């Protein structure tokens, strides 16, 4: 939002877009869907409503991305009902699409109908550390090593004339 | 080490007294070029590697411990009848946990007139750098005697050192981590330059053999202990006018040491006259 700029122009220009530009983070479909068209005049009357008609379907993608930055495992009632989406199909499908990315890990379980999960997202601390930050040591020593070359060559470019 | 004549070359005095001229080594920086330092050469190469490293209690309390942590310095005392100078020096020495430099007032009277500023400069530099040392200078009457002749020039030299520290305390008036307490028995022979206001802001005075404080100390010394109607103070205050004495409170304590034998419950004139004739 507006943090480092203090002027009484962007405030009044941003007042109609403020409630919705903050409403994007929470990502409520049914309520904010009516809130937009309720008082929406200028930001939707800007023309052809292209980016906002794509935003109405982008609310669920920004919300599931907020879930990607949030807890990884998905429940059947708490977070599925919280996200206004009670469907074990696209839930496990999208979560699986987040597992195949490689940035996080998850699992699926079915005992009595509910989706269980061990939710062990413990960091690599005391869990294969050498393989964890081995490439970190090699890469950091390569960049710092070519930085050593970058502090050895300029002295040559200094003593080259004298 | 004696002196440094130029860069990368100096002279060095041997232990036997003979001065040696040896070029210093280039690795040693200029930090080891201190004139008064403990340099160490080699036995054969004669090269240096590194140097070796060489109301009274209320006024005293509020005048010492309050300006130390939170500020006039100096609690100069007086009074030849009482001994003093120990219960307050040890009282501050045990109440506050800091450094204490107790030295006799004639500690810088030696055969070398140049050693004075070195000794008082070392004591003052460890008192300003080591810890907030409370230096106790006692009996300044011996060093407070002026002189003009040249035969006794050592006393005039060490009193010129007394003026040197008299200026160094002017430099140590504000924002210094040191306390200079002082004690003496005779203030008549003291020069007015030492007792000048702004230097010793505390003139703490103790009671005296004077008859007013003797009568007040008799009344306050008979207020606490048990008394009787036979005890009279008129003869016991007129007789001390004929036979004069000091430390009468200690004589009353002796009367307590003669009536403490658990033989009589209430002390009377028998132990008073007995204490007068014995002690």
């Amino acid at each position: 939002d507006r943090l480092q700029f203090r002027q009484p122009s962007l405030k009044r220009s941003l007042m109609p877009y403020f409630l919705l530009t903050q409403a994007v983070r929470t990502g409520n479909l049914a309520k904010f869907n009516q809130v937009l068209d309720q008082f929406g005049e200028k930001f939707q009357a800007d023309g052809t409503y292209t980016l906002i008609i794509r935003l109405r379907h982008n609310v669920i993608k920004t919300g599931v991305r907020m879930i990607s930055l949030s807890y990884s495992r998905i429940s059947l009632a708490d977070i599925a009902q919280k996200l206004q989406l009670d469907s074990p199909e696209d839930a496990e499908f999208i979560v699986a699409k987040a597992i195949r990315d490689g940035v996080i890990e998850a699992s699926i379980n079915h005992e009595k109908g509910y989706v269980q999960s061990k939710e062990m997202i413990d960091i690599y601390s005391t869990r294969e550390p050498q393989l964890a930050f081995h490439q970190r040591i090699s890469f950091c020593l390569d960049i710092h090593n070519m930085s050593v070359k970058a502090m050895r060559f300029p002295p040559k470019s200094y003593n080259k004339d004298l | 080490f004696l002196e440094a004549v130029d860069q990368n070359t100096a002279i060095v005095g041997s232990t036997t007294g003979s001065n040696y001229y040896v070029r210093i080594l280039s690795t040693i920086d200029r930090e080891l070029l201190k004139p008064n330092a403990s340099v160490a050469l080699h036995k054969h190469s004669n090269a240096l590697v590194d140097v070796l490293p060489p109301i009274q209690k209320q006024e005293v309390r509020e005048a010492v411990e309050l300006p130390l942590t939170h500020p006039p310095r100096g609690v100069l005392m007086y009074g030849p009848p009482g001994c003093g100078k120990t219960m307050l020096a040890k009282a501050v020495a045990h109440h506050t946990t800091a450094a204490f430099i107790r030295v006799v007032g004639s500690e810088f009277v030696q055969k070398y007139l140049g050693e004075g500023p070195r000794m008082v400069r070392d004591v003052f530099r460890l008192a300003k750098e080591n810890a907030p040392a409370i230096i106790f200078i006692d009996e300044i009457d011996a060093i407070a005697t002026k002189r003009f002749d040249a035969q006794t020039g050592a006393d005039r030299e060490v009193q010129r050192i007394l003026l040197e520290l008299l200026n160094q305390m002017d430099g140590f008036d504000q924002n210094v981590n040191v306390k200079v307490i002082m004690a003496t028995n005779r203030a008549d022979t003291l020069d007015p330059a030492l007792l000048r206001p702004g230097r010793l802001d505390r003139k703490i005075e103790f009671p005296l053999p004077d008859r007013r404080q003797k009568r007040l100390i008799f009344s306050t010394i008979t207020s606490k202990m048990n008394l009787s109607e036979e005890v009279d103070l008129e003869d016991y205050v007129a007789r001390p006018d004929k036979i004069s004495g000091a430390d009468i409170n200690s004589i009353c304590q002796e009367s307590g040491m003669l009536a403490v034998r658990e033989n009589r419950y209430i002390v009377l004139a028998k132990d008073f006259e007995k204490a007068y004739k014995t002690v």
Binding site: D1, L3, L19, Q22, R25, T26 | -
Partner: protein
């Protein structure tokens, strides 16, 4: 410091729609929840 204004604006602006204070409501939510 504008660095803290991101979190203070995040939670402050996030609660601007509803349940802004919510501290006065706990006294009524103790007996009901």
């Amino acid at each position: 410091v504008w660095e803290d204004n991101w979190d203070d604006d995040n939670v402050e602006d996030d609660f601007s729609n509803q349940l802004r204070a919510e501290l006065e409501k706990h006294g009524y939510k103790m007996e009901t929840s």
